[model samples]
Target: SPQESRRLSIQRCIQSLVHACQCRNANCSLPSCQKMKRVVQHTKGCKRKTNGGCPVCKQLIALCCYHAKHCQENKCPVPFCLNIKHKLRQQQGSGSGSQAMDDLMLSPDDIEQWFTEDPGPD
Candidate 1:
């Protein structure tokens, strides 16, 4: 563990739209996009998570949940992406924005800029 790269990794993924809705759409052909698609496929293959859950499946949920928060697509295809946002919104009703990134290792200031837009704005 000599290297430290959380800062770069987050920005790198953001630039590639790693967990965004479009990556799943298969139009863009970046390694980041292809990797994202593969992980989704693997998790979807598992498809059923209950007690103790599959490790890969949970990874999907975690990524999808964060993607959900940043997602604006009315019909995002990242499995449960929309539902997570709606669930969080309802959970936070009258709760004062205490969610605090909820463990995506993402920071508030960094996310604030992108979250305000659909990852980009014209």
Candidate 2:
């Protein structure tokens, strides 16, 4: 089994390398490299946008904040977009049972509350 052992060792090394590459430039609190290995053998450039926006969303931070159609520049906070992407992706990938995932899910009520609240100083 020596050959198998060596192969396993090499696999572990490659896995570590991939993990390092995936997060090299990502600043989000959550890890974005979860499904990267399945999609790529090795990462190319970082997933984060060159202009400092979310890779998933190329649009800038629209005044609506929730809507993507109104975005003008790539200045939306990266962390926010990361959460939105992570939560939505998690919901779709997992069967919506984890309590942790529940925290990430935003219902219409959440949007309603935001709209009802006063738009304090921008």
Candidate 3:
């Protein structure tokens, strides 16, 4: 029982260390450490992804905000992208530095709807 308890303590310490490493550079929200711990437990021995860490596990730890590709390219105003553009406009008017925000009030759901209707190549 003593040996088992010691092993358990070691595991706990290792887990805490890993959690700290994971959250060090992450833009983690409140209660993030607890959330990361749960995520690690859920995906301890999974294979990593090509783009980054394990997709399933990374998603658990990362709160992703996806916008349309066009929006990311500055050609359209998608949900998250639109907000970013809005903030920029508020700070700086349409000067010679950057082009003016297109007078297109795209619906919040347009990007998702367009993708669902006509999803391009993956």
Q: Which number leads on lDDT?
A: 1
Q: Please, what are the lDDT tens digits per residue for candidate 3 over residues 39-111?
A: 4444555566214655543332222121121123444412233444455557644422211222222333332
Off by over 4 Å in 1: 1-8, 14-28, 47-52, 93-122
lDDT of every predicted structure (CA atoms):
0.50, 0.32, 0.36
List where candidate 3 sits over 4 angstroms from the true fold. 24-122
lDDT of 2 at 81: 39
Worst 10 residues of 1 by lDDT: 111-120
Measured against the true structure, the TM-scores of the candidates, in listed sequence, are 0.54, 0.21, 0.21
Per-residue lDDT of model 2, residues 15-39, tens digit only: 3323534465544243323333212
RMSD of each: 10.7, 19.5, 19.3
- 2 or 3, greater by lDDT: 3
The residue pairs that clash in candidate 1, if any, are none
Scored against the true structure, residue 56 in model 3 reaches a CA lDDT of 46
Candidate 2 Cα outliers beyond 4 Å, as residue runs: 24-122
Highest TM-score scorer: 1
Model 1 lDDT at residue 34: 57
As for TM-score, the candidate ahead, 1 or 3, is: 1
